[PDB]
Each structure stands twice: as structure tokens, then as C-alpha cells.
Amino acid sequence: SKSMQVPFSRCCFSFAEQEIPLRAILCYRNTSSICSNEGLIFKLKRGKEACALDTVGWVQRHRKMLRHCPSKR
Amino acid sequence: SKSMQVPFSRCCFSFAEQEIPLRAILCYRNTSSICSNEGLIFKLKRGKEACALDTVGWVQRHRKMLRHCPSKR
Numbered sequence: 001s002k003s004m005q006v007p008f009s010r011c012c013f014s015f016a017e018q019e020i021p022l023r024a025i026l027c028y029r030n031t032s033s034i035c036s037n038e039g040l041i042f043k044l045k046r047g048k049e050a051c052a053l054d055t056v057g058w059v060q061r062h063r064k065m066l067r068h069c070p071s072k073r
Numbered sequence: 074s075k076s077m078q079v080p081f082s083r084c085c086f087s088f089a090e091q092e093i094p095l096r097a098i099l100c101y102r103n104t105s106s107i108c109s110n111e112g113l114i115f116k117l118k119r120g121k122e123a124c125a126l127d128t129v130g131w132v133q134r135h136r137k138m139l140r141h142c143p144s145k146r
């Protein structure tokens with residue numbers, strides 16, 4: 001287990017205004033706890049991503065319909 | 074070009090204390106301009122990464138010896 005690592009944080013400072021369709025989303029990532037701010041990250045198709053604010057209804061409803069994104073190692 | 078996207082920011086709030094060997098690094102990523110803080114991200118082997126503070130000598134010397142990380146699309 002190679003760990004010279006001090007990872008970067010994934011933060012959401014700007015958020016999706018327009019509702020993203022559920023069909024367009026693969027999974028979600030939670031933002032880093034240091035810069036949390038109730039943001040969520042939806043993994044879209046072809047490598048794309050979108051920050052979404054979890055205090056908004058459609059974000060909560062979508063989050064409840066998707067699993068957390070998996071990671072490599 | 075699918076863009077429903079509002080990307081997350083890559084930030085560096087904690088930094089590498091111990092110097093990472095140049096041989097262990099593939100390239101570097103600059104942090105997002107919103108949360109810049111003079112941090113740098115070094116891409117390590119087997120998917121790993123490390124935040125490094127660009128006001129420190131070894132970080133500046135290493136940065137000058139590596140190219141910027143490429144991206145998919």
C-alpha cells in the first residue's frame with residue numbers, strides 16, 4: 001500500500017441550477033468533509049460531472065435513486 | 074459536446090511535509106482558481122496524488138522538471 005499521498009479535496013463551490021435528468025447520471029460522489037457545504041457530485045456520461053446542492057428537492061430525489069461512485073486502486 | 078456540467082474544484086487544504094521523490098511523480102495538476110492557495114497537485118503512480126505547497130523549494134524544483142497532467146474527453 002503506497003502512501004506518500006496527501007489527496008486533494010473535491011469541492012463544490014458553484015451548483016447546478018437546472019435539474020439534470022436521472023437517465024444522464026451514473027452515480028454520485030460526496031464532496032470532501034473539509035469543504036462539504038451540502039454539495040453533491042453527480043457523475044455524468046463521457047467523464048463529465050456536476051455539483052448539485054443537497055438542500056434542493058430534485059437533488060435529494062435523484063440521490064435516493066443512485067448508488068455512490070466506485071473507485072480504482 | 075455534452076455540458077449539463079458544473080465541475081467540482083480540486084483543492085489542496087493539507088500539504089506534503091516530506092519531499093516526494095521526482096521519480097515517483099508522473100506530472101502535476103494546478104488546483105482550481107477558486108481555492109488556489111498556492112497548492113500544487115503531483116500525480117503519483119497507481120492512481121495516487123499529493124498536494125504540495127508551491128512556496129516550498131523542492132515543490133518549485135520538482136514542478137520545473139515535470140509537465141502538466143493530460144485529460145480525457
Ligand SMILES: *[C@@H]1O[C@H](CO)[C@@H](O)[C@H](O)[C@H]1NC(C)=O
Pocket residue numbers: 030031054
Ligand atoms: C455524505 O454526506 C452525508 C450528509 O448528507 C453524511 O452523513 C455522510 O457521512 C457523507 N458520506 C461520505 C461517504 O462522504
Ligand SMILES: *[C@@H]1O[C@H](CO)[C@@H](O)[C@H](O)[C@H]1NC(C)=O
Pocket residue numbers: 103104127
Ligand atoms: C497555475 O499556477 C500559476 C501560478 O503558480 C498560474 O500563473 C497559472 O495561471 C495556473 N495554470 C493553470 C493551467 O491552472
